[PDB]
C-alpha cells in the first residue's frame, strides 16, 4: 500500500520549481499514528538564494489521512539565507503518480523589515 511504502523508506518529491524534498519517517514516542519527519530539501527555484545544496528538514506527519507539516531553516555549510520556510499539506495517492499538495510560508528580513511571504508547492513523487 502507498501509505506504508512512504513510512518504510526515503522517498523523493519534486515540485513545480524543480526543488526536491526527501522524507524519512520515525514513529513518535507519544503521539499515535504520528511520525517525526526528517530528511532534506534541495532548492532549485529561479531567482532565489541557497540553491543546489541539501538543507535538513523537520516536522511531523499524521498517517491516518496522510497529512504533513515540515520546515527548513536556510542555514547550512554552503549558504545562509537567514530565513525559514514551513510547508503544510497532504498526500494524494489516488492517481497513478502520487502528489503532495502544500501551502508554504517563508519568513525573512528585508533590511530591518521582517515579512512572511505565502505560496503553494505541488510535489510529484520520483519513482
Amino acid at each position: 500500500s502507498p501509505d506504508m511504502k512512504l513510512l518504510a523508506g526515503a522517498s523523493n518529491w519534486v515540485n513545480q520549481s524543480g526543488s526536491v524534498a526527501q522524507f524519512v519517517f520515525t514513529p513518535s514516542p507519544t503521539q499515535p499514528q504520528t511520525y517525526e519527519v526528517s530528511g532534506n530539501y534541495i532548492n532549485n527555484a529561479q531567482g532565489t538564494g541557497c540553491k543546489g545544496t541539501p538543507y535538513p528538514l523537520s516536522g511531523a506527519y499524521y498517517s491516518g489521512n496522510q497529512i504533513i507539516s515540515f520546515s527548513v531553516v536556510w542555514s547550512n555549510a554552503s549558504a545562509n539565507c537567514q530565513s525559514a520556510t514551513g510547508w503544510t499539506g497532504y498526500f494524494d495517492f489516488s492517481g497513478s503518480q502520487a502528489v503532495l499538495k502544500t501551502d508554504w510560508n517563508l519568513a525573512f528580513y528585508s533590511g530591518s523589515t521582517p515579512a512572511i511571504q505565502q505560496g503553494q508547492d505541488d510535489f510529484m513523487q520520483s519513482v
Binding site: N80, C81, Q82, L106, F108, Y109
Partner: peptide
C-alpha cells in the same frame, strides 16, 4: 557560508 540578506534577495 555565503550570507544572503534573505532567501529572495542576495
Amino acid at each position: 557560508a555565503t550570507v544572503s540578506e534573505s532567501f529572495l534577495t542576495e
